[PDB]
């Protein structure tokens, strides 16, 4: 089920090499791009035992005083660091033999695909004789055909929500005596996105307490589930325009709490919050 | 005993290279992905001995005072750091000679297999002439055939539980005068998963105290074994839908304590707890 | 829709190699240029419990005093560093065999394209016999043809604003009871640039409160939206001369607050400010 | 519009290799030159809460005293480092097979071009038989032909000033109720250099307040714009002798404040100052 | 305008390799020499706000005392490191196949050229059969022909002085109401070296105050310009014997202040001093 | 003017490889030897401003006391590190194909040449069949022919003294009202070594004060010049036996102060001292 | 003057590789052994100037007190680190193609030569078919022929003593009014080893005070020279059995002070001591 689309590729970085000499030139251009995230968690437990003892004689031994301050201190400290480095590089080398009196031109464009919100690095290497009218592509526009996943029909489509950075699915647990959203490795928990005039409602199918089905943000910040109402707190706002599709990255922004968005945070007894300035990317996928 | 399945591969990262020049181009793309975990445990023992002695004369030697504060301090400190670095990389290089007036297109998809919860990196390299209608695959869906292990029949199947990160099996030991779960290298300890209307019950076969067979979470957090009851504390919730199979990664989430899950933690005299926000991955395997 | 333009390339770095010997020489020149940005965020929580106890006897036990100061201190500290290294290199090697009694000359120019504000590294390698009249290019001027994107018609063109460094779009949220600009991953929010005699007005289409449409800077610094007036606070100044085009990097400088410019900053409940000495680069793109 | 010039190349570093043996020798000489600039900006926020409580009994409980000093301290510190490494290397390898009974001689000269103030590394490799009269070039003088940019006619030439290190153009903003120079990404701001008997005057075309056109240094240090007068404060001194040309690196030194020069500095509400011992390099370029 | 000269090359480092076996041996000797200079400049701004409050009750609440010392401290510190690494390596590899029953001998001499004060690394590789009378060159003397720059005629030669390490020319500015020497990027400032019976006088041509022409050292240390006198303070001593030539590295040592020499130092409002134990190398060059 | 000499090479390190198999073996042995000296000089300037204010009420507000200790502290610290790394490596690789049933034997000897005090690494690689009587060379003695520089005739030979580590010549300056030795870049200063029955006298030719010609050590440690006397303080002791030659490394040890030797040290207003336990190597060279 | 000897090579490390497959296998085994010694010497000079001023009003301003404690502190610290890294590696690679159904066996023995106290790494690589009776060499004994230096005749042989680690010869200087041993670069100082019934006596030839010739250890520890006596303090004990030879590494252990040995140590005014637990290796060599 593919769809046509207008891709646009804006410039990023160019490079030209005008070989004028009689000899040819071998040329190698390596573009490296590398992320490296490290998450350390040191716990330290220091324990000191100090025994001070001062012997002083000023009043009775009149003429002056001798104050002998002995002191001892045994300090036992136990540290325990725990790093977790994760790194990802992408080297891209291109070896080209540039002929004599030919200029080589690399144009690195960043091709952003419309609709789908996909982007890809679009290099353009040319080798042509000199002198000539140089054609620098500031913005290229290509007509692409995206092969696309199954469309999510809002209402009557069971989709499981997944956090993109964590790779942990959205689950339902009982905080207080209320159903509440939490990140978890379980794929059993499913959701159904609904659309009213107000906005998007995330309804659960697997809920502990019966009736309490539609997700909403509390005054505190945490996510709980309530009954279907006309409350703007239980509505949400999706970043991508309809229709929603398989493997679609979205960011649920609360309608009442306009600033805040559905996100991960290390809270007490719940870890899916609607905090101010938090637009966490949720990949949503469909069940078989 | 293989089974059919719908694999789906969502986009991750793309890359295009439009060679337009008369000369061909050799191209090398190295994708590195490397984890590195380091676990240090420093113990430090400092020991100071300080001998202060102050001689003061203000009262008797009237006009002012001379206060001579001598002091000494011998500090013997012994440190003992112990790191344990473990690193795992996976470099993936692809050398390709791109012909003249041909574009090369790499599409990196992340192929998530349905049911089994397996995922794999699915690269798609193409080399085709220009200009042409570009076909960007946002979501590919493939029909795969998983060769699958032996199915776990809930009741009448002896399975030993194993912690995925630690590679240590679940064992039974006597905490207080109660059988309790602990991580250990022994494979002799076996379990039988049962399913009632409430949820999943982890029953032991090798227990110290007779009768106390089914796993349950205490008010404290630690795991103990009790008799068969209608208590939701002794039920559990598995992340993968049935049927359970060999080499299946699961996360046992307590039914009463909805937030907490069966997990590893450095506690006193037991190291398998049901702590809040802890979904530790247990690979469960079948005995021969 | 391409346009002609005068490119100018000013000198950066030169290099000459006069091989005079009878034997030829293989020559390899690697130009590396590498950025590496690292963003750590350590949170530390130290917790000390100290129990001092001093036993002193000076008054009653007359002749001097024995002051025995015992003390204890248990210090539990938990650190949690989180780095996020991102690095980008660009190595450029050129292997050339220089013949006998020939000089090789590399001239590295930095070719700045006019109008479009694009720049690219322009190397010039020559190989010629010796001795000869050396031709050093301080400033080359080339006539280029920029392939350019769709032109933004000021008024009647829906453009979404995007922060260049963050790759986050400009969005509208309700700060206080006022519509206010914020960075966000949502592409649904669109803007229309207007031009009066005073300057450039950024009007929103998707606003929460009706009427409050045109962006303006407050006395505090934060960006809010107001009605259309003759106020210089709601005007702005764009760095590139007209016409504005697709994928155009701009810097909106407030007309009233001449120093300040539309920018990202970690504020409370809004993150798009007009702070003094802040010229953040906004790529603006057109909707399909 | 090229011009002739006398290039002079003074010695830097030599190297000789006298192969005397019957076998030839392959020789590889790599000259690396690498800059690496790193700009970190750590912000740290420590927050301690300490609750000391001491219970003492000396007066009433007569014979001595027991002073029990309990104390607590919770220290929450949040660090946030942000490095920005930028590195640039230039490796230059030359592989040469030196024949038997031939000496190889590399002479590295630093060729400084006259007038234009351009410099380039000028290597001289020779391979010749032995023994012979060695010709060491301490100072070579070459006649070059610089291809030069468009000449700046002082008065009636609109030139935009650009900071070389920052790559940020000179702009005009309103500090106090006075037009003042600031660095900015806007290319709209233009200047016209004038020459009187006193010195060089930097006049603006785009000024906020009408009349206040010519740049001058204040008693504080900051740059403002005033009317045309016979004041030496508004004159300047350019490092390169006339005529000024496209892509010309200059350093504007104030005539009154002889020590100080037009430069970048992080001041409050203006960032282009005339500070003592500051000769910042301004590339000045011409408008199309 | 070349001149003959006696080069002398004293030993540095030798190496011999006596291959005695029937098989030949490939041999690679890499001599690396690498400088790396790093110049960091960290600025740190710490700001603490601490609110201590102690509540004590000893006098009225008679029997002992409870002293409850609460305390708070918010410490905001901003660091800003700025390194500037510059590195220069020179690897020199020589691959040689040593034949059977032949010894290879490398002798590294450091060839210091007379008069001109130029030096160069002079390797001597030999390959000869064994056994033989070994000829170790402790000191070689070669007759070279230096190609030399234009001679500086003392009086009637305009030369601009340049600091070798900084690559900044000597300039004249007004410190107090006196002309004073400073480092600067301007090449407009010229000097004329004069020679009397006493020593060398550095006269300026471009001076602010008329008459004050000849350089001299003050009692403080800084360099100013005075009228022509018989004062030894305004004389100087050059390290190289006459005649002075183009691209000549010199060190101006004051005649009165025999220890001190013309040098760079970060002083207030002047940066060219005559400090004790400072022999900074000034390259002096001639104007076209 | 070459001279014969007995070289002796004592053992350092051996290595044997007995290939017994039917297949041959390629073998590569890399001997690396690398020095790396780093000279950092950090200057730090911390500046604190602290404003404490305590409000206390105990006497008047009778029953106890409230002591509110507010405090503030602004700490501005500026650091400025400056490293200067210099590194020198010498890798020596030897690739050899060892034939079947042949042993390869490397013997690394350190060949110390007599008289001249030159040393060089003397490797001996052999390849021979097995089994055989192994010939291990503990001490080899070779007859070499040193090509030697011009001999220094003690008296009537102008030689300039040079510090080996610093590469700075010995110069004469006026400390107090006395001529004194200092390190400097000037080659104009010359010396003449004289030999009496007592020892070696370093006489200057270029001296400021007439008569004060012969070098001597003071009671303080610094080097000054005095008239010719029978004082042992002005005599010296050279490490190499006569005759002295060009490029000869010597260590001048004072005859009176037997422990101390002529050396470099950072003193006030003189930097050539005769300190205890200081045998700095002076290369002495002859003038043309 | 060679001598026969029994070499013995004890096992160190083995390695076997049994290739059983039909395809051959290329195999590369790199043994690296690398020493790296770094000797830093940081000198730091901190200088604080602190101006505290407290204004207090409690007595007169009755009801409580305001105590305003202002304070200032300017801390100027200058650090100066100086590392001196010296590293030496020895990589040893052996590339071998192991044929099908052949096992490769490396046995690394450490061959210690008798008498001479020389040792060398003795590898044994074998390649043979499988299966076979494996012959593991725990201890090999080879008959070698050491080519040996000139024998030292105890009495009537002038030998100069040299410290192995420092490469500095033993010299004589006047500590107090006594001749004393010191390390120095001078080769003029010679010694003659004598042997009595008691032990070895190190006699000097070049001594300052006449008569005081034979080396002995003081009660302090330092080495001085005395007349010939029957004192065990002036005797010594050599580690190698007679006869002593050229380039012989020895350790002189005092006969009276049995624990202590002739060694280097940074003492005041002498640097050759006889300290407890110090067996410094002295290479002793013969004069020509």
Residue numbers in the entry:
A (entry chain A), B (entry chain B), C (entry chain I), D (entry chain H), E (entry chain G), F (entry chain F), ...: 10 to 297
Passage from the reporting paper:
Lysenin, the defence protein of the earthworm Eisenia fetida, is produced by coelomocytes in the body fluid that form part of the earthworm's immune system. On binding to sphingomyelin (SM) in the eukaryotic cell membrane, the toxin undergoes significant changes to its secondary structure and forms oligomeric pre-pores on the membrane surface, as identified by electron crystallographic and high-speed atomic force microscopy studies, before inserting into the membrane, which leads to pore formation and consequent cell lysis.
Here we report the structure of lysenin in its nonameric membrane-inserted form determined by single particle cryo-EM, to 3.1 Å resolution. No other oligomeric species were identified during the 2D and 3D classification steps, indicating that lysenin pores are almost exclusively nonameric. Thus, each of the nine monomers in the membrane-inserted state can be divided into three domains: the N-terminal cap domain (Glu10–Ser33 and Pro108–Ile156), the β-hairpin domain (Val34–Ile107) and the C-terminal receptor-binding domain (Val157–Gly297). In contrast to the α-haemolysin family where the β-barrel begins close to the membrane-spanning region, the long β-barrel in lysenin spans the length of the assembly. Two aromatic rings, one formed by Phe70 and the other by Tyr79 lie on the intracellular and extracellular sides of the transmembrane region, respectively. The lumen of the β-barrel is lined with charged and polar residues, including 12 threonine and 9 serine residues. Hinging on the flexible coil between Val157 and Arg159 (spheres), the N-terminal cap domain swivels downwards by ∼20 Å and rotates inwards towards the central lumen by ∼35°. The pore structure of lysenin reveals that the β-barrel recruits polypeptide from both the amphipathic loop and the two β-strands that feed into it, from here onwards referred to as the pre-insertion strands.
